[PDB]
Symmetry: C3
Subunit: 444 residues, 3 copies
Amino acid sequence: CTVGPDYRTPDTAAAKIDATASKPYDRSRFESLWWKQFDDPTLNQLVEQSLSGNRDLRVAFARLRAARALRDDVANDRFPVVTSRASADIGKGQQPGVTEDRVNSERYDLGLDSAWELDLFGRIRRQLESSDALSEAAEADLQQLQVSLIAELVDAYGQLRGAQLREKIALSNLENQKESRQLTEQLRDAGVGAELDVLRADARLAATAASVPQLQAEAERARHRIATLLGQRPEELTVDLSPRDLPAITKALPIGDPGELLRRRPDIRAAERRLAASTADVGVATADLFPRVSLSGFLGFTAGRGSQIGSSAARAWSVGPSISWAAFDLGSVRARLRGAKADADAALASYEQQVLLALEESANAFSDYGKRQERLVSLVRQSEASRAAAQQAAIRYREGTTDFLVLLDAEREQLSAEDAQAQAEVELYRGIVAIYRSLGGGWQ
Amino acid sequence: CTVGPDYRTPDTAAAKIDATASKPYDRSRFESLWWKQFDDPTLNQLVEQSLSGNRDLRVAFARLRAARALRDDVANDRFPVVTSRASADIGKGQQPGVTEDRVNSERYDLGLDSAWELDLFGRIRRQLESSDALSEAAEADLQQLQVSLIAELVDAYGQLRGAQLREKIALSNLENQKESRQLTEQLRDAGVGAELDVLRADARLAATAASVPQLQAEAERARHRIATLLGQRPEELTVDLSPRDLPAITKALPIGDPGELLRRRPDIRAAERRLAASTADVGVATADLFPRVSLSGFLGFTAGRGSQIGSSAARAWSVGPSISWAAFDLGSVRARLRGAKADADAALASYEQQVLLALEESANAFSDYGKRQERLVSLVRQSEASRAAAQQAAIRYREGTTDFLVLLDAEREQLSAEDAQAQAEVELYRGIVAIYRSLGGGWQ
Amino acid sequence: CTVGPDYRTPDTAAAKIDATASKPYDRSRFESLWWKQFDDPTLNQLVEQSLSGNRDLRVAFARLRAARALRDDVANDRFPVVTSRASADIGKGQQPGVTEDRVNSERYDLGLDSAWELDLFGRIRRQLESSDALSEAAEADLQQLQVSLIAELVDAYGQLRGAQLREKIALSNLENQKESRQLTEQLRDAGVGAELDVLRADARLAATAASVPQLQAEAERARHRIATLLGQRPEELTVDLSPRDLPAITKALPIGDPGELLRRRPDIRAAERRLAASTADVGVATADLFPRVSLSGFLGFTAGRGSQIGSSAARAWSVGPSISWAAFDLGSVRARLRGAKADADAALASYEQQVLLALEESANAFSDYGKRQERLVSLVRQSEASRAAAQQAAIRYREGTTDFLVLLDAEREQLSAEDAQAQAEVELYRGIVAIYRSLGGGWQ
């Protein structure tokens, strides 16, 4: 017999995301190694090294082995437990029932003890079923951490490239603002301009200069993050991260069927396996409503005189079958059952929350990616217009045919446009990372 | 007897917040359903649906039932434990004391076993007292999560309305900047203007256009959040969230006496009940300093021949009273006592931290609300002035009587003023949410 | 005997940070009370009071005492356990083997029971070794929390001073913008200016006014934080926090040898002690591969008639030596061993992650501090230039020799320069705090 409910997987509907019909996506195939589409061999090396060196990943793998070890232990409980023992019981006292004289007592034992709960109503079977589910849950945790890790690593690499990009932009715009400052300095020294212009120019030049260490600071924080994610010290980072361009994907994104995502995501699987474990735990609690059958034994030697231990005149065996039933203490058993059922309900609600958060993350990532493309279109146009306006005002300032503020403001709007655009490009990249994270890629 | 300390509630002083005398607040009454004052029926529906569907809430309710089940189990420990059993002991060996011959042994038993610790010094009573306190702590957790949930939901709804508001502002200002761009385009084509103006106008137009997808992106993230908080998939959201205005409260806020807040807040109660549980646990540890009285029994049948089980010639009963005292192993008992007392101290310090954080949150919310009103006054004036300045510069640009930058900068300052004002209005709304969160509203 | 692996400390290389050779740092000495270099007696008082009143610190100290109590309990397990007991066994039934008559049974006992596992293979010794390591781990947690607390407190105090600084800046710039607004108002009333100027001036004046409550709001949040960190209610804060200047350190920072940091940091120590505990736990699991020796006894009185208890005719003693070996159930023992080894691997990977994060935090703090100095140099120049430009434009606006926008924009750039500089100064201060946090200062 095996009592209590048999686990059935929740019948949960597949994820529908209508935006996936749209043009930026390719539903016919899904890349598990999603990050390789960036065609960035450096990045690829980072991910490979991360899988070897990352310590959080190494922790989670040990926790899996621990969970399996626990399951292996539970697995043995089906079989009788045979131990060997040698003991004695010596004393001197009265023997109530037998005699009021203080008499000597001497007993010697050497043999195998055995003990065994027959799993008649499946209590042990339901434990093993639970323990197996948790074992599988720990494996899904390992895989989810891998998904997270890769996303964090790819995301961080993109932030480094963004900081480097923005640095160069700042440095390039700084040179315009030195040339422009040189020009204003020449016009006051020729008698035609004014110091007010030089001051404004030097102020703006200082402002742009202040951004460069800050961007350099962000970059260095991103290098430090990347190193810890690889399992390396910051000093000892084996991958060269010299400035290269920000990776892009010109192709439509291979995202596969979005309905598949709940089945691909290990966090969802882990929550489902915890639900299975807790469902099995209801069985364990239900079995205690029913009788418990056990069988003890002894095989070996028993004597009053030690010299006889090991001889055939002192051979001994014993058998002790027992069945026990909680005749009146069902109150406590039914309390534990009510607790088991509540934990199962919790695990079900938990599982459903994970499903909901996955659909939320997923909805969020696609929703953002679409909007981040749109935003980038108009930001690219701002950068174009601003470069054009800046160069016109420069001409017209040199010819004395407009005041400096026109050129000051045009240089200001050039910087912020270019910089806003670089931020938006980074955000596209991060949105790709968000997408594949939400779909459960990189653990296979 | 019941040994160890009797729990006394901490005598903690009521919250004093001097700013509550101020005009924006009404101390005569407190609205438990605080969110209904916004007069927003959509929002009301969100909260109602959230209480039904939110899975985190469903989890916490199962955890309460689990805690009660545990308490019910502990509750039984006062009574004797009677189980039924049928067993045998068969063997063949020597009988030390009796005979050196290997002899057959056969015993058969059928009856009720009973076992019972008399709770003479209140160890079990102190367990039940602990377990009851934890049970009440789990209920307070459920209520605190409800407070948090409602605040998060109302807060998120306000962010959605803010994004929608800011979107329309951006769209409205975009149209000014198209008209203005059209105008600059007309003046170059009439021979009197310049391309520099058109470029600057197209740049600024692009910048404003870039904000619209971003605001739309925020809005869509807020919808996704709201859906998960309701217990729904993003696709399946039953409440229509089409753009409507941001809710306001024209009345002074019904906040009640702020001294009441510590007594209303379930987080505080939960920490207090954990302090009570740990205080009872000192009793449990103290009881082990004292003797332990127990009583076992057997009632049924006992015989050497199985055919006799059930007959009156094989009737059997047994009684086994026992008292035990740790004569020398008080060392271990006193160690556990020292640990129990330390846990109680921890629980007390924990409780005090919760009190302090509550007063911090509370101080913060009122402090911010007051300042957010002030800020809004002057920001409304900036918006007025900026609209006026923008329309003047527009006139004077059309008449050729000022250069474009005057109109460019005036359009820029109009956008940021209007947008800063919308952000500040949202922040007022969120500050109302912060306030009622800190006072412990929505669980009743 | 003591079986299983003997713990050896991980041989981890010292932290190398090449930037420490640089001029802003002093490696010859390290200040444990690092915060006192600010020469701020108020701050010093905050830290002193925090160490007395902070409840999180009080919690962690109770948890240490609890861990020690647990170790004390485990420590007793080496010695025999002697308890006193008085019991009886009364009944009436058959005596299988002896007689088929239902006979009366009566036994009375009064004496000392003793029980003792001889720690032959060091199972108990390895428990105590584990429990001692955890005890030391809880002490390191207390010290790490102290490091964190002090850093959070000093950091928060700096944010308060920053808000106060920025407030005064805003107020000062507000007065320029009132004077400037008054001026524009005078020029329209003399017939020579225009309303467009007044509107722009009033707009900008409102904008600056909106920042003041916001900065005041931040300040008040920082006061509330500080109070909770001290263990005080916000209302009851015993330290006067009236505006004073932001603390600086003109001297090079006493950072000591950076190689020392891993040895100084308590988080690292705590992780190492958990590794030691888990290593000892492998021993505990290994001991169960080997036989278990135990010795029970009874000393006192035993009789069939109660009146005889206490008499010498009813004297009784008993000795019960036993050795047991898992002859076939090594499967379960070896499963637990495999689990123990996995936990040890986890604890090792965990320890290595802590080392890596420490080096990351550390790398980050120095890296940022250097860059934050550079940034501040150029930001100070922006503030100088902007003040100069603002005062020039003011002159040239009064003389009617430039339009208002020139003065409007110059006032705008003055405010943001001054404000950006104050933020950068605060960030320097916070970076000092980050540094000493990462080096593990303040617990000694």
